[PDB]
Symmetry: D4
Subunit: 128 residues, 8 copies
């Protein structure tokens, strides 16, 4: 039973990886391990990072926030900012290649959000 | 409120072919798994070493439990044209028998799994 | 391009001897990169056959009809049968079965979804990779 | 009544990169080639041996004619730029990036010698 | 663990499928199920059919013969025709292959003989068909 | 210097039950050779041109250098005299044969190096 | 008489990287899994979501039992150079920590399998 | 083709600014289908050998016929006089290239084209 977890396959989330901005993702099954959640005492979910160069990872629930839209990003940065060096880095706006790919991810996540979970699973699940 | 959902294992009947082990899946292009053609259809994937897919009517689908169902499925389809009946009861041979067998082995391995895991393992890429 | 009857992305029905009128999309040859040619004296267009098992060919304009929807198929069969050899007519009127019926149906579903789209969007969604 | 269409060859400017030869294309997933963010963007593919793609603002696009435009593009982007930004913009590309930029230019010039339909059939990167 | 069976992954065998000639094969793991042998009371092995259009199947041990070379094929046909109780089956079994199937059978033999000239490890790395 | 054909050469190939088909001499994707001796009698690895490409090891006796489509009629008439063969191809096979001819004629208009880079089917 | 064979799980040390979960494999082009350079090397595949491969010296390989070995591997590797030691003891972060973690998860799942099954499941396609 | 210094399948060392002399093979552009061009100065399209293959159009002046690994030391010393040993990921991939190039060198041009031409 999946009806008992906070997130399920196809759910849109923001993921935080140290040294990267909060990123638009979808919860998905590991292409090899075929699981989407696991315990490490602490729950993790397998996610896919939206964009033109897709990546994937096992991210802790503590580092996930349900995706509603782009408007959440500012508060996510301000809350994550609140190490002295880490704060100055977190508040700084993204540039170059990473800004383009982050933008590409948001466009994909917002398109995915306008869909039922089944359709977005069939359209946005990245093949590996 | 639908009889089947993505990941459900079914037997599908296509005229001129034996009842085949399948899984209900989303269409790779249309991203839907069910549609109305007044009469409901489901998109399915045919299990085997040479996978295929199709939009099959609900009337031509039966929930998959295991291989043991096949004999009754043949006998019921045969009872439901004199030439059609003799063809339906005849056991499969050669390439088709091997691929049918391969499908059953895949479907039974899929059946031993939770729906989420079987979707992640057995959904054929297109 | 604005001077030819058909262009890349246009939906057409194609007739190949021994097959039913099939839902297609005019497309560029994956290798030759042309979508129309003269065989020049007679014009041909490269088409992709819609379905779960996609195929492609260079089809003569005489064997192409602009696709509007499934409702045209009956008249296409009846007109092709009247134009046809006594054996050819009986074959043309006979309804498709098995694997071919399923794939023809799959093509129709794809063609009708493609028809509900702007040419640019349908080229980006329905052009089969080769 | 839009400035660019699918298959049009453009130069794109991405912060930290030289003006790059591109072709306007449809997003492989979203199937659109232009969108509004009040400000118009176009989906482009970056030419070269390691292809990439992005949604670039119209203000950061210039119609591609040939390699000869690049010098003026650098000099105009430098004049429009922060003292540090100008010194960086005028500096010539080297190593892997110079090779890939060169590869893109060769592809873009070969694409330019073709009718829009033929270049779409040959140079649209598969994703 | 895998030291007790007649065949192992990478072993070259001839496989008999009803309606087809004895075909050059390699024993291999199922690309999805990751097993190379199973019991159905009767043992089966997963094989890949050599040729330009590769295929795969689960074949019963009774329908497998260790591959030494092309020279075995004549005796295999001869033994198959003698074991076939049906008169029609025998005439079919002795008939030589033609067209596309003859070419692909030939292609398989060429691949199998190349594979035979290699150590098991090397032939697994070169001839295992990707799926 | 003694072989009639080399990688990239355009040939017509005859396979029993099929019309003379537009081909190109190529290396085997696995065996990496383009010619061999079966036994006494030389074979060449070829790739059949068309929208559904295939490949095979064909005997030299079943190969004829490709110049163009105009050769096909004489090839049929000569194969018929040496022997169904005279009957014209239809349906799917006629379309794919036509597709092969179009590919072979485009390949013929190119230098050997360019045609190897463009028309060698990936496997 | 070789220490490792195709399918064996090992930890590999590449200068500037943490000890990484690998599996011994045949080179996809050269079809060999071990060679001499005098000194023996093995072809390995680095486990993770972004797989890589390399020819690694036997001296830089340690048989993989599980994640619990990593701490002692770091402490033993921690190097005559003073700068090298401080770098080696420092814990991995960001993208590399995620991919290292992904590799461990894959290596531990591979370890729970018979050599034949793990070669069929975890040999990365090239 | 019989008139140029290099042809498709020939093994060469390539020099790209900021990289060590790298074991390569002359090949046709997967898109442009040419293997040499003039830019007054001749270039050849090459593929860099290794586990992560790359390709580029390199000037003839930056190419040297590949005989074996033993040439590398002199190539560095000559390139330094005209103007540090490789480590980590790059050292491994360079090593992987040498192994591939030396295997390719032991083969006839035809066979090495069929085995070592990287698909794109
Ligand atoms: O198009 C895209 C989508 O994915 C990206 C991930 C990354 C990216 O590097 N990461 C970190 C990773 C952890 C595990 C693997 S990758 C994620 C942002 C946090 C960078 C650029 C990307 N571009
Ligand atoms: O490995 C496999 C799995 O799929 C098959 C389908 C078929 C097969 O031909 N069909 C009919 C089809 C209808 C739509 C497309 S395909 C299905 C059995 C009913 C034949 C062999 C197969 N082998
Ligand atoms: O999914 C599909 C779509 O394409 C098909 C083509 C055919 C099919 O065979 N044809 C004939 C062809 C012309 C040249 C190559 S293929 C077309 C119907 C006219 C059969 C089944 C198909 N199923
Ligand atoms: O062969 C190529 C073509 O594309 C490249 C893009 C880049 C490259 O990194 N960029 C920035 C990007 C923004 C969005 C995704 S990529 C483009 C130059 C501006 C670097 C090298 C490349 N090499
Ligand atoms: O290149 C090849 C190799 O494989 C083939 C298998 C077949 C072929 O059809 N078979 C029967 C099969 C059973 C299971 C799947 S396929 C095998 C010969 C017995 C036909 C042609 C082939 N050509
Ligand atoms: O597009 C194409 C090209 O290749 C074909 C080969 C065949 C085809 O079946 N053959 C026979 C073969 C022998 C070895 C493998 S294939 C060749 C014509 C003689 C049929 C249709 C094709 N369509
Ligand atoms: O998912 C993964 C798995 O492989 C990686 C290798 C590397 C990685 O860069 N290396 C060094 C290499 C040497 C030869 C080629 S790659 C290995 C860790 C030592 C970095 C990140 C990875 N992420
Ligand atoms: O496996 C490999 C082979 O190719 C490489 C190229 C490079 C590499 O970056 N280059 C520079 C390039 C110029 C054009 C595109 S790439 C070449 C060494 C000079 C780095 C690592 C590699 N690893």
């Amino acid at each position: 039973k999946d009806h008992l977890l906070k997130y399920n396959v196809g759910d849109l989330v923001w993921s935080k990886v140290s040294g990267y901005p909060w990123w638009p993702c979808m919860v998905s099954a590991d292409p090899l391990l075929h699981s989407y959640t696991k315990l490490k005492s602490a729950r993790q979910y397998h996610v896919q990072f939206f964009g033109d160069a897709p990546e994937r990872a096992w991210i802790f629930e503590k580092s996930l926030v349900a995706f509603e839209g782009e408007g959440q990003f500012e508060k996510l940065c301000q809350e994550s900012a609140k190490t002295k060096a880490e704060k100055i880095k977190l508040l700084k706006p993204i540039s170059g290649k990473l800004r383009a790919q982050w933008e590409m991810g948001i466009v994909q996540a917002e398109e995915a959000a306008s869909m039922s979970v089944e359709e977005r699973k069939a359209k946005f699940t990245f093949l590996y």
